[PDB]
Paper text:
The type IIA DNA topoisomerases (Top2) are nanomachines that control DNA topology during multiple cellular processes such as replication, transcription and cell division. DNA gyrase A and B subunits assemble into a A2B2 hetero-tetramer of approximatively 370 kDa forming three molecular interfaces called N-gate, DNA-gate and C-gate allowing DNA binding and strand passage. In this study, we reveal the complete molecular structure of the E. coli DNA gyrase bound to dsDNA and to the NBTI molecule gepotidacin using cryo-EM.
State 1 was solved at 4.0 Å using 60,548 particles and State 2 was solved at 4.6 Å using 53,655 particles. The 4.0 Å (State 1) and 4.6 Å (State 2) structures of the DNA-binding/cleavage domain bound to the double-nicked G-segment reside in a configuration similar, but not identical, to the cleavage complex in presence of DNA and ciprofloxacin with a RMSD of 1.78 and 2.01 Å, respectively. The 2 conformations mostly differ in the GyrB subunit, more particularly the TOPRIM insertion that rotates around the GyrA N-terminal arm with a 5.0 Å upward displacement. State 2 corresponds to an intermediate opening of the DNA-gate therefore referred as a pre-opening conformation, when compared with the larger opening that can be observed in the conformation adopted by the hsTop2β39. State 1 and 2 correspond to a conformational oscillation before the opening of the DNA-gate. This pre-opening transition is mainly undertaken by the insertion domain acting like an anvil which positions the TOPRIM domain in a configuration ready to perform the opening of the DNA-gate. The subtle swiveling movement of the GyrB insertion domain around the N-terminal arm of GyrA leads to a controlled stretching of the G-segment by 5 Å and spatial separation of the TOPRIM and Tower domains, a necessary step for the formation of the groove that will accommodate the T-segment. Although the overall resolution of the pre-opening state is lower, a density for the gepotidacin molecule could be identified at a lower rmsd level, suggesting that the gepotidacin binding site is compatible with conformational fluctuations at the DNA-gate. In this context, the pre-opening conformation of the cleavage complex represents one of the discreet steps that DNA gyrase undergoes to open the DNA-gate. Conformational changes of the DNA-gate from closed to pre-opening state may conduct a signal to the β-pinwheel through the tethered acidic tail promoting a β-pinwheel vertical movement.
Numbering used by the authors:
A (entry chain B), B (entry chain D): 402 to 474, 483 to 790
C (entry chain A), D (entry chain C): 8 to 422, 427 to 443, 446 to 524
Write the structure that this text describes.
Amino acid sequence: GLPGKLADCQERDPALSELYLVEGDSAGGSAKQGRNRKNQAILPLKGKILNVEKARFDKMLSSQEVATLITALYNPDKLRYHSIIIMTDADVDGSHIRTLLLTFFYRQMPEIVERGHVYIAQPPLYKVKKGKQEQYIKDDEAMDQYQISIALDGATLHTNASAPALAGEALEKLVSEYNATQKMINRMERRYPKAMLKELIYQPTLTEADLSDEQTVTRWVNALVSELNDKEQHGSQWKFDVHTNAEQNLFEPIVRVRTHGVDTDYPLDHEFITGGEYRRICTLGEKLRGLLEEDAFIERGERRQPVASFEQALDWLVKESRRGLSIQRYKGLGEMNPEQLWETTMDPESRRMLRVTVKDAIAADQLFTTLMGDAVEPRRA
Amino acid sequence: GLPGKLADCQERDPALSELYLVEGDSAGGSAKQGRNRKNQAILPLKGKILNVEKARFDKMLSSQEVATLITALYNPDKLRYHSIIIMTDADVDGSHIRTLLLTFFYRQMPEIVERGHVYIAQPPLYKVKKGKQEQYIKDDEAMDQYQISIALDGATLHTNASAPALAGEALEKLVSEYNATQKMINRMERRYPKAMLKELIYQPTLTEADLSDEQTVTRWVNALVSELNDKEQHGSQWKFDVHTNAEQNLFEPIVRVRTHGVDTDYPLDHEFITGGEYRRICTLGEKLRGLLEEDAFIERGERRQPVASFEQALDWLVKESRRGLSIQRYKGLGEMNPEQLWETTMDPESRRMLRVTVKDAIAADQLFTTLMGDAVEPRRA
Amino acid sequence: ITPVNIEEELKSSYLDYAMSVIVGRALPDVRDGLKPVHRRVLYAMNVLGNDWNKAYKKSARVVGDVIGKYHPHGDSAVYDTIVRMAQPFSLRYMLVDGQGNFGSIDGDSAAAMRYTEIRLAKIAHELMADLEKETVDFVDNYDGTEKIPDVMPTKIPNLLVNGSSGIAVGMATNIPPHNLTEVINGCLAYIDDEDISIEGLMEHIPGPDFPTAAIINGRRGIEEAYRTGRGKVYIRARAEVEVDAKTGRETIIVHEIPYQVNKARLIEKIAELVKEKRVEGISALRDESDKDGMRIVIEVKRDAVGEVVLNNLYSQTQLQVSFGINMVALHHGQPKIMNLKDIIAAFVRHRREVVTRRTIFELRKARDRAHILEALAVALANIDPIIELIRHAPTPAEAKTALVANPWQLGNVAAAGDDAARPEWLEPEFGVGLYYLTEQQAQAILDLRLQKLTGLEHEKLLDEYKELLDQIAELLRILGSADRLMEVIREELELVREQFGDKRRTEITAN
Amino acid sequence: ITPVNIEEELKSSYLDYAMSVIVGRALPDVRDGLKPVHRRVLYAMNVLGNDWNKAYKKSARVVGDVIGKYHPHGDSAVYDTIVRMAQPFSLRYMLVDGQGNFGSIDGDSAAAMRYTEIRLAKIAHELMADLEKETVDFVDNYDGTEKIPDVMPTKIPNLLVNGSSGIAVGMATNIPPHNLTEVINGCLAYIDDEDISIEGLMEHIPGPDFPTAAIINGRRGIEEAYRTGRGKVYIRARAEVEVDAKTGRETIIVHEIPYQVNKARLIEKIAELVKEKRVEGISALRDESDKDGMRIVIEVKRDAVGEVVLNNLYSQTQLQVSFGINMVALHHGQPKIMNLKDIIAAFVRHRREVVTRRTIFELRKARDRAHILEALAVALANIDPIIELIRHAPTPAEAKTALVANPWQLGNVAAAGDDAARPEWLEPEFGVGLYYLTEQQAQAILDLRLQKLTGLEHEKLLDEYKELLDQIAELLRILGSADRLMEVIREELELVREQFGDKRRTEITAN
DNA sequence: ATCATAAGCCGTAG
DNA sequence: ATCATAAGCCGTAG
DNA sequence: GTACCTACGGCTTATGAT
DNA sequence: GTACCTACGGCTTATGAT
């Protein structure tokens, strides 16, 4: 219990020392190698811990070391280690054991959470080292923004538009909006094919008022199918179709694609035209077609090349930026050096903790383990 | 003690059941999977056991399970398991632990060895399977004789000697004697180079009476050096020298060889000429030169090829024999199937046990661990 | 800096873990019937090059390789999965042919990973056939440095042949094995009739199959499971009474135990029940099992009919156990209870797609090879002017430029179909006698040897040209009509059935 | 069949085990200073292709590979040996550059074998340089299917640089590390004077070296060990007193501990001795070690000089420990106590042999290449008749026969040394203008391309021919006189010394 | 108060 | 004599 | 070189309560 | 996912006996 695992600090007064909970060997080794000997305490853990609701028995106990060392298990008398911090791996198993620990503490001692004593650490996730330039990155969005900054470190575009040398915050915001739109298209790709979505970037606009003339609809769908057939380098075909479902017209185009063995149609509806996704697509397409970015000249920072596509230029710039960088990803607490672990996780001036709240009394724990909530909750569509 | 490891048989009367001692898991698993349930008992072992003389303490005990289960540790009262068998791996570590067990029993209970109860198993060593033809081989000499038989399965040599078709027991005995002589030469190679030893097979004889004429000695050494230079395809040279250390002659040739950077001489002495090794070499050389085996024709069993060397023909025959065979070597008791283990090690009709003797009372155990015997015994030169 | 965070984050964490597990670990797919662990193991064994007709290899190499390159999730589960496949009494058709202590029905675990020797079997190559022909997609590894196939271009519906049994955070599935010949017959019948009924499919396949025979009693359960997806079925062992020709006594012989039954635990429980007086008519117990078949002997107590005792055993002993049929798998990454017809249709569609992609790849390869051979033959036609042009030109690049810049005569001995002899990306400005070269063609000409100037290389080239013409014609034909494609599928399935045919093991006695 | 066997067999068994162990496990060799385990590990790392300028690799891959192919004796000892090499505080020059938790001086073991990443260092390639040039012999594995080098063609006497410490059934050895620069200087001095005395060698190399500095007191022990092979030497830690500018109090600072000392055990023993009243003048104990250097603080009790307490500590505390110098190694497979001069002589002889064999191999390779290039140039001289001969001959074998059967003209533009331009096995019936071909030469001619007919390939061939002539001339020259060989050895050793120079760490204070 | 007997540790191996 | 509570097993994962 | 802990669902088997 | 046993020599350190 008290010996073997718990390695307390010199100070015996609570509310001054901190307690940590990690995986036993791989983490505790470096943790004890790098910890301080004044207000530091580490309690290792072996594997996982049983749930409270799935098997509720006051006599059921396997470790009991956490409770035995924190309190007497009843708490107002002894409140040793007023501050606790949970360090955990960044994987799904770490998140799972974190959830188990959180619900365990919540269902055992509500007061220690109400009085604001539980804390969660934020371990780093990426280590980017561009020679002398080093960087510690923790989140996917932060990594993406850092990559975008490295790619946009002082470029200067030269098109035949109104601006001879277009560069700066306008171009950066345009690239950010383009990336957001590409992410939205990648998310919606589950419904419709990607070829038409990518081609709508350069295809002209469309309005519900265009349902008057059949010639305009035919011209638009013919240009669309022709450009699709031109851009198609793989084994696929594209056909057009004009449909009228109305009293008189309600012109509705239908795009016919021929993959390996099965044809598939994709009509166009008023709801699809009115949808905010298609509206944003049309707005960005107009903004990009109003650029006249055919003949372009952008350099970062000693070489430039004229291309015929803004996305091709962006890919070339990203490649030029990612030529000479190095990235190491730490996939475990028992992977870095003790000094790095200290400085990046438990430095009272460099760490980034997290506070838990007691906002509302809800039945999340009740819906946790019934198999009914387990069947009904996966509605992530 | 009694539970956990010991798995006795149904019969409780001693002198009918047998006890075995092997490595614990890897061996005991298959042993229990293949053992009988009438008169079979297995006691696993974990690692090694301390020595008796190196650390003698009646209070010193770690397992004590062997003694506790065999007797009360004093023996005439209880004599359970009158028969014991020791199965052990065929490696040097197995032989070491076997020696430890033997000296342990000898220094603990002399009566169990005097009354003839200790037995040692002889596990197989090679598994030769030539398609349908299978074979179990236990010793290196047995393997070698089996290979020689497979190579000499009905060949028929056709030289220009007195026998038109020479084959059979004479040729087999000649090959056996040649192999024994080659082994003797490989053993003596530590002293003298191998080129001269191999060339003495075809070089003419030599007699101590040849020390009268210098011309004969010069002719012999010149032929020797010339043939050595002819056969030398690597980067070496050969020179001759005639020496006279006597009142008048005592002709003594000296062979000078030039390797990479250092020359080395090898005089010929009366003792070397008289040695039984050189005598056997001369006898075999005469026997082989009296064969006239230059133009030969031997087939086994559908192809023949005339060569210019008997050893080359032997190598070709060995290659033709070893073309289509398969060999598996079992390097551990936990490597074969339980049925094979049973049938080949502990079948009361197919096994091959071994009996220990109490011949003499000697101080081998005394010289075992003193470091003085350990320093003086390695005289294997 | 300690930003305030809501407690609601607990829901975002558990949902992510549950989704990741359900998608990637437990539930298999309908197109392969294989877990990602088995997928990575088979892919590693294929890349390493351990065929069936090769020497054995140590397990440590394969385990370390899989851990290092594809599956960085320990070694214990990987080794257990490997040992599971090699057990004959655990699968209807083994996949990993091994050699060594692999455990037995007695519950004894296998030896360490430093003793066994494993390799692929003949049936394993039927799973990953035609892999490098661009038949499936490639998925990146954890660090984005390698490629992993998404689905296996299989030819046998392993999901229905072997099945699996896993449990997820939300769902759990379990499918009994079946016989290969009846599955092939049902596939052929469905190819014949797309609108076949459940009775027509049930008529061809009576019931499931097991590695060890058994006795099936309930017929309603298997039908309800085949129609909906859930049902119960009972398993009964094979036993019989024995009476000597003389007075003797009654004796029970056990020839086989039900599926997933421990023999040692069963014998221990029977001995305990006999000691507890709960069962009557039992006097002693013996064992006569050997390397010729399992045999258990139970001595009947004197003055006992034994049939009542056997019925009491069947009621209480594990010799009669039910089975929780539950068919749940993934169709587009979503757990969906699917019947037999849907699985067969998905298998047929996957096979069609694989065959089509392989045909396209082979057609493109043959087109490129024929287009190169055409220019090679043209260069073989006129040789002497090329010799002078090479002898005069100092720079090989200048020689290539001079070759490209000048037309050619197209000798009479040099001069197929009207089209389909040229690549798609080829521009109409070449090959309009009249003929022009290309930088790639010029480099191919520069890469020629002197051995190609004999009285046999010309005939070999002409033969290869005619063969490529015939092959591309046949490929265009099979791409034209789907009836030929269906004929090829039927012939391949009939060949597979003829290769790996076997006999029924279990037995179905309706009530 | 139970044949009677004598009890004397016990001696034949133990002797075999003792001999096998002493020969193969514990005692290293004087030519490498490496154990067979290290040998197999380095050979596996070299064959796998894990250089210093490449990406890291998992340890499981290397461990499993070594277990499978070369060292089938477990994994625990192999992993421990691998971790031993990566520790900076355990060797003067590390060999395995790794990344991860490798333990520290606190006695904490390293992590599992599924977390670390290791690769070779720049100094490692200096050990196994020139391996594929047939410089050493190959030894078969346990089953006779692979080849293992017997000795490593090293350039640095690792035995004297790092040393080792093993114990056998009969003997036990232990050698302290040393400095590289002084070893190179001693080697150069011995190359200068073969009859150098022990004092001349001792003058260049004062004493051993350690990864952590220390204090050496006894000078007689190291001299006796260098002269005979056995001796004792004391190691003293570095400490000092501290008194504040004000009244303050005395304080002891510990900058370094002796070699092979556990810090936690030492602190625990000091605390125990203070509690047991056995030591006086000690009040408390603290620690100030960080990532900038180890620092231990001991608070001196009030009213104490502290020097007597420090002397008592040096007498009792592990801060002063002796060392059992024992130099025993193998020379021809036999344990023989050998001095410094013998080791240096053996190193020089090994280097001479390696250089000679490499020179012979390179000379043979250059001879073969030049002999092929001669025939290639001859074929380049006359081309048109070869063209007609190829055009007429239907069979390539018949064309080769016709080429071999006919002599050649040896044009003026085609036409070195009088000899050394032909292989040894070449018969005098070829190359007697006059010239003849060979079946190998004819096949080489048949294996020509069209790119070799430009105005630059001829000049390239002539340049390569002249370069090969110069190279074979230089090789014959260096094989002629051993003085050039010694000059090359000296230059290479000076270059190695210039590459990996460093500064002394320890300190020697004579009494 | 001064000599003979019992331990622990170092690294490969099982 | 008929319902509520305590277990064991199946396969990946630690 | 080796023995006992957890999640996760669906199934069962056994045992005390209505 | 993890705690205690052995050989083998040379060295030491500690503790009871002459």
